[PDB]
Amino acid sequence: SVFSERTEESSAVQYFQFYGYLSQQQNMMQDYVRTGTYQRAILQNHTDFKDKIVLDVGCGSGILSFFAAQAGARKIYAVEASTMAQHAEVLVKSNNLTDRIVVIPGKVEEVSLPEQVDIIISEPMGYMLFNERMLESYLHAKKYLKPSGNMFPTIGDVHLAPFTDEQLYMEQFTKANFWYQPSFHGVDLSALRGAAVDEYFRQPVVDTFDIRILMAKSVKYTVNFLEAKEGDLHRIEIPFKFHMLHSGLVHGLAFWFDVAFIGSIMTVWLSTAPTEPLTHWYQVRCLFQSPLFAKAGDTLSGTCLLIANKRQSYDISIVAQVDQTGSKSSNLLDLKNPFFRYT
Amino acid sequence: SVFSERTEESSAVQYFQFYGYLSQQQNMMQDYVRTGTYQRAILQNHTDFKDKIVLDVGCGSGILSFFAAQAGARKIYAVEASTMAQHAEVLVKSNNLTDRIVVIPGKVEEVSLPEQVDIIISEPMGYMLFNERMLESYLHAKKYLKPSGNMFPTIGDVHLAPFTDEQLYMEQFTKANFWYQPSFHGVDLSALRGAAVDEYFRQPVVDTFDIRILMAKSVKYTVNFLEAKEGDLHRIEIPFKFHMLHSGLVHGLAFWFDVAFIGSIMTVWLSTAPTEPLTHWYQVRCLFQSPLFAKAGDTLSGTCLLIANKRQSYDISIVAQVDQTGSKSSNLLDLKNPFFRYT
Amino acid sequence: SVFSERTEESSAVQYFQFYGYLSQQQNMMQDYVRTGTYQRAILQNHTDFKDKIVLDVGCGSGILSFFAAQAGARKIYAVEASTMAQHAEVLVKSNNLTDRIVVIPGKVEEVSLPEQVDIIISEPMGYMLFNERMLESYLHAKKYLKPSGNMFPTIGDVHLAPFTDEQLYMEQFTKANFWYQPSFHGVDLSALRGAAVDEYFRQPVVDTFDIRILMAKSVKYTVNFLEAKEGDLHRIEIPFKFHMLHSGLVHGLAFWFDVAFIGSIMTVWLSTAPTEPLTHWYQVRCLFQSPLFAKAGDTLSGTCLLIANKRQSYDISIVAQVDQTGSKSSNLLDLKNPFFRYT
Amino acid sequence: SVFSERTEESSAVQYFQFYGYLSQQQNMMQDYVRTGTYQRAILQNHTDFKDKIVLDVGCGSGILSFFAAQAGARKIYAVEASTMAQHAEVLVKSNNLTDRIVVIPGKVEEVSLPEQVDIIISEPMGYMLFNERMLESYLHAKKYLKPSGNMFPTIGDVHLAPFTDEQLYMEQFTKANFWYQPSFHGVDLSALRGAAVDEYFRQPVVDTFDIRILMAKSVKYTVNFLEAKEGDLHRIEIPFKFHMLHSGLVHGLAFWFDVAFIGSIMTVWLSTAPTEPLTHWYQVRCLFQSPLFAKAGDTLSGTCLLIANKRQSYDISIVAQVDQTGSKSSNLLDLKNPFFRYT
Ligand SMILES: N=C(N)NCCCN(CC[C@H](N)C(=O)O)C[C@H]1O[C@@H](n2cnc3c(N)ncnc32)[C@H](O)[C@@H]1O
Ligand SMILES: N=C(N)NCCCN(CC[C@H](N)C(=O)O)C[C@H]1O[C@@H](n2cnc3c(N)ncnc32)[C@H](O)[C@@H]1O
Ligand SMILES: N=C(N)NCCCN(CC[C@H](N)C(=O)O)C[C@H]1O[C@@H](n2cnc3c(N)ncnc32)[C@H](O)[C@@H]1O
Ligand SMILES: N=C(N)NCCCN(CC[C@H](N)C(=O)O)C[C@H]1O[C@@H](n2cnc3c(N)ncnc32)[C@H](O)[C@@H]1O
Secondary structure (H helix, E strand, C coil): CHHHHHCCHHHHHHHHHHHCCHHHHHHHHCCHHHHHHHHHHHHHCHHHCCCCEEEEECCCCCHHHHHHHHCCCCEEEEEECCCHHHHHHHHHHHCCCCCCEEEEECCCCCCCCCCCEEEEEECCCECCECCCCHHHHHHHHHHHEEEEEEEECCEEEEEEEEECCHHHHHHHHHHHHHHCCCCECCECCHHHHHHHHHHHHCCCEEECCCHHHECCCCEEEEEECCCCCHHHHCEEEEEEEEECCCCEEEEEEEEEEEEEEECCCCEEEEECCCCCCCCCCCEEEEEEEEEEEECCCCEEEEEEEEEEECCCEEEEEEEEEECCCCCEEEEEEECCCCEECCC | CHHHHHCCHHHHHHHHHHHCCHHHHHHHHCCHHHHHHHHHHHHHCHHHCCCCEEEEECCCCCHHHHHHHHCCCCEEEEEECCCHHHHHHHHHHHCCCCCCEEEEECCCCCCCCCCCEEEEEECCCECCECCCCHHHHHHHHHHHEEEEEEEECCEEEEEEEEECCHHHHHHHHHHHHHHHCCCECCECCHHHHHHHHHHHHCCCEEECCCHHHECCCCEEEEEECCCCCHHHHCEEEEEEEEECCCCEEEEEEEEEEEEEEECCCCEEEEECCCCCCCCCCCEEEEEEEEEEEECCCCEEEEEEEEEEECCCEEEEEEEEEECCCCEEEEEEEECCCCEECCC | CHHHHHCCHHHHHHHHHHHCCHHHHHHHHCCHHHHHHHHHHHHHCHHHCCCCEEEEECCCCCHHHHHHHHCCCCEEEEEECCCHHHHHHHHHHHCCCCCCEEEEECCCCCCCCCCCEEEEEECCCECCECCCCHHHHHHHHHHHEEEEEEEECCEEEEEEEEECCHHHHHHHHHHHHHHCCCCECCECCHHHHHHHHHHHHCCCEEECCCHHHECCCCEEEEEECCCCCHHHHCEEEEEEEEECCCCEEEEEEEEEEEEEEECCCCEEEEECCCCCCCCCCCEEEEEEEEEEEECCCCEEEEEEEEEEECCCEEEEEEEEEECCCCCEEEEEEECCCCEECCC | CHHHHHCCHHHHHHHHHHHCCHHHHHHHHCCHHHHHHHHHHHHHCHHHCCCCEEEEECCCCCHHHHHHHHCCCCEEEEEECCCHHHHHHHHHHHCCCCCCEEEEECCCCCCCCCCCEEEEEECCCECCECCCCHHHHHHHHHHHEEEEEEEECCEEEEEEEEECCHHHHHHHHHHHHHHHCCCECCECCHHHHHHHHHHHHCCCEEECCCHHHECCCCEEEEEECCCCCHHHHCEEEEEEEEECCCCEEEEEEEEEEEEEEECCCCEEEEECCCCCCCCCCCEEEEEEEEEEEECCCCEEEEEEEEEEECCCEEEEEEEEEECCCCEEEEEEEECCCCEECCC
16 A cells, blocks of 8 residues: 555554554544634534535544534545554444444555545644654545545644744753763773764754744745645755844754645644744654854755655754855754654 | 574564664663662682683673673673674773673674683573573573583572462453444444454553452462473473462563572572562563462462474463363464563 | 961961850850860869969960869960950850959960970861861960970870761762753853862861761871970871671771870860760861772772862872772862851 | 952962863853853843954953853953863853954953953942952952943843841851850850851852842942942942831841843843842842831831952841931841851
């Protein structure tokens, strides 16, 4: 399958075991911004659902499919690859919806649907939008979408902006310098200090922060889910030119994302921006190995290149330079292994 | 290999990926009770190492092999299956011990060792002693042990005792009660209530506690590593009879473990008991879905059965009854998916 | 004067300002082991005091002189160089003792006494016994002592023993590694890391510890105050040969001291040993820059050389080797600048 | 020199010995409010530094001079009288800034600078702003400032307000009551009771506190560093009139300070107020030996007089009265000998 071809089995097993726990489903369901905004996007756009055929890609507990049914959908195909499919089936029956919701256990790349659909609904967003590579499954599902069918969400916006955070930056050395000692119980650990520093800096930092650490207006990269192909997400190149609003040291790039449900009645947005209430996605920061000094009015230019890997994630390459000084920084990060810093 | 035959590939990949990170090594190394106790066991029994051949099973960073080198070992084979093996080699070179510590990358079940050894050293203990199934690798390594050889640690004691903790019980129950709701955003979840309670109560709780929650003297189950065979650990049956010292609700069983390094000069103990300073093993508690009432003087009897699985862990069944009343509790726990409660 | 010649003025000013505070006098007076043992040594040896002429070297508040008066002394000359002399004079008057106690403001090296004395009393001990160099003032005062006069205290014993304390040792690097960072607010501090390590290791550590960290029986260096000359304290060479009782890493030498009041009726001891209740002297530890591995039964030999300086303290040189292995360590410490670690 | 004429040698030696230690630099540098605020003031006013000549008065480790170099300064003269000057030189070389930062060892009152400067930067603030008398050195340095030059910081605000804190009062009184005893080991100490109370209450208390102990809005005394002369700080008279907002016992006056960096781009404030995050300056409280009762609505008036002394500090007299009743308190404090209470 398209799925098995881009995913190492070991990663897939762990991934679907994770989503097999009711507690994980519960954690997502209790993210009120998330769950409530999906319900609102669907119910306030009831004409996109009333007596329509729906596909729910990765339905989990089945919650979005129930929202589609609340909006009057004629038929919803709820596809789910983890053992959560069995629990979803239990809920469709106990909610007296077997006539309208059909749970199909399996990967959307591998199951067959009996007919084409009017609209696809899904919640495929990971950290930095793209983590987990579930957006490719969502795009893949368009083989079942009628011409001029719709997608909920319709678009995804990733935002990037430079930040200053001296304490976050210094924390990496404080941790790595554990290895910078000549007699840990008689052992000189110091030769591994560099490798420890490298390891810490390869981890994107998942947590939130005060918006005043941001040093320029964000740059936006947009995926239009109606138009994009799966293959478009294998290599994501995000150029940037930041016009610095504040003078100081740039320690890295901060990431967040928005999605929009562009319905016939209205467009509804779900935002994970640091200006909005917190979600279980938090925000993500990628540190530079060497911070960059910039003045207000300087421009910081470069590229964030996301390369998909078979562990359902991305290798992140960020290169940046201050155009007025030629001062340059790089970093390579592993989005599969983020550091969860939030407290 | 014996390892691959008992281990799903998905579990193994994740397992060795986890131990390849220097941050994880740092966390273990900074458990001073652990590291310091190992060092004392080895250095205070230096005659068991002096001019001897040593096998370090799962050497990680190499720390135990450095302790063996400090005690005068002639040659140490340091076997390690994760990429940490490469960091160990770096430390062996920077500590000028290339003539004495030989890193052999690979699984101890799969590598070839050049000669038989006088003594095996390892830290194969996981949560509840048996999590990770590394004890089987430790025993498997005895194929390289000379007939009169020694094992450090030499024996392992598992302790179990009944506890009362209404707050922990209610804490888990509260999490499960989410699935009781008849109208979560209009959706009836209640048909999954039973499955949710099962799942939450299937999680052993890893943290520490006040010894005053313990309601009876512990029962001890001993594994002698010099004598035991790998196959002995596929099915571990721990019968118990507690003489209740206090009246109240028994909410479950608490578990901890001790190991002994039985050297020629002295026996050194490493204990994870709640009466001892905390270690990174904490303690483990298995909750009953329904607590048992017992009076002081009653006997609480039954069995804790651990059945090894291919995710390098155990399926635990605990059956316990209050002999005087016939009140019985049966519970199933998945040692692989614990709730890390300590903060 | 002999005093001004061995003491920089800047050090002397600070020193006597310190002892000019009633709060400092109070801190010493409330050390019950100290104050109570002096009172007992004097009162239980009343025949060394009854109708005798006494000199109190550095009388502070006058407390020891009052003890000499309680024991029946005919005349006590209480010499004190700080402004505390004025407060002592206030107490002699308010305690109706002007007929028996004469306060003489000034340095004992500079004042004149009207007659010779039978006994000198003083509390001249600093950290590691010798800090503050007040023992030289005490010895100097013997110009006023009759032949076969006595000294209270009569002898001083400094004890040295090797210790292991991995956490104390590792703490120095944890602190110094603050400087091992390449971008502290944009500044690379790393070039000063070595100097910071050196500075921390030059400080003797003042605090107490568990006696189980000691790795061999102490070696004793004795000053007989009846026999010693001032000049004997300018260069103090303490050879040692420790016979290791435990195997492990030696991180340094621990110091404490005893004094004895050898009276006609009995000898009374004041001990600051780690086996005795704590005093305001605590104990003192000097770290080795490189720890030394020793086995039980090995011998650790070397010298502790104390060289007096004009800041009323000593430059400490410690050189040690494990005779069985030839492994060697040094350190140079500044006793004037100790690190007060006690909590 | 102007420095030696106002400073006892004993005080100066100790003063510069203290600042020669890297551990003390580390403590200051790790005050993140301080370091970060200085860096912001300088970098956000980079046009006040770009291609300019800078004098850093008492540069210590050199950190402010590095901030000036970051902002584009053409040449920075970094003057430092302690041996820290040698560590600064090391950092200037290892940070490749030898062409821009020039360390000049010595007292700013005594060295020769090669040219006049555009801007002076320093951190001359001590406890209560004026402790250490370093502000006079800062002002003295204006002999090198070009006519249109700037000072960073530009102004300093001292705040004082009445407080109530029975527990602190009793804490000090309790320490003094030792000297009340009529029979400490048989000795009557009481004649020194008054002297002891004076001494303890002469100590300003350095720590922080809840703003709810403050009984009136603060009164502000401003020093403009662009305008002030050295001689202005020999005698500092701060009159005050508080409009009491709460009824109760006034136990003393609390002090803190703000400084402003008045740059061409923006003014940046560094505040040590108890309403702001804690700094290593904490706050300072001067206790009355006898608290004053006041009702809400009353006025508390008087003067805080600071007279500079040759131990690089001030003798403080605070006279305060409750205007409605004539209740008056006069107190004397020695700013050089504070009680560091924070833990
Ligand atoms: N919030 C995040 N970070 N990520 C996303 C939210 C998780 N989750 C949401 C559940 C539910 N819709 C809800 O909104 O509540 C996505 C589910 O999609 C399934 N899946 C992933 N690839 C699949 C595939 N190729 N074929 C079938 N199923 C798949 C996973 O097993 C998982 O149950
Ligand atoms: N503390 C816990 N909870 N459990 C205890 C685990 C601690 N850890 C020991 C670390 C070492 N003594 C140190 O101090 O660093 C286990 C190491 O053994 C290796 N290993 C596991 N089976 C292996 C195998 N079959 N063949 C080779 N290597 C193996 C793992 O990769 C890991 O590196
Ligand atoms: N405990 C410690 N660490 N050290 C020692 C205890 C401090 N203190 C004890 C006070 C009192 N006898 C008591 O037992 O309470 C010693 C006093 O000796 C004076 N002095 C020091 N050289 C002096 C000199 N050359 N000439 C005159 N006076 C001198 C100092 O000013 C100080 O007041
Ligand atoms: N924080 C407090 N409580 N007070 C604030 C002090 C902080 N400290 C500033 C440190 C520096 N900016 C840094 O960030 O490191 C004072 C330094 O100024 C020097 N000095 C003092 N008078 C000097 C003089 N007359 N001539 C030359 N040098 C002098 C001292 O030796 C000391 O190095």
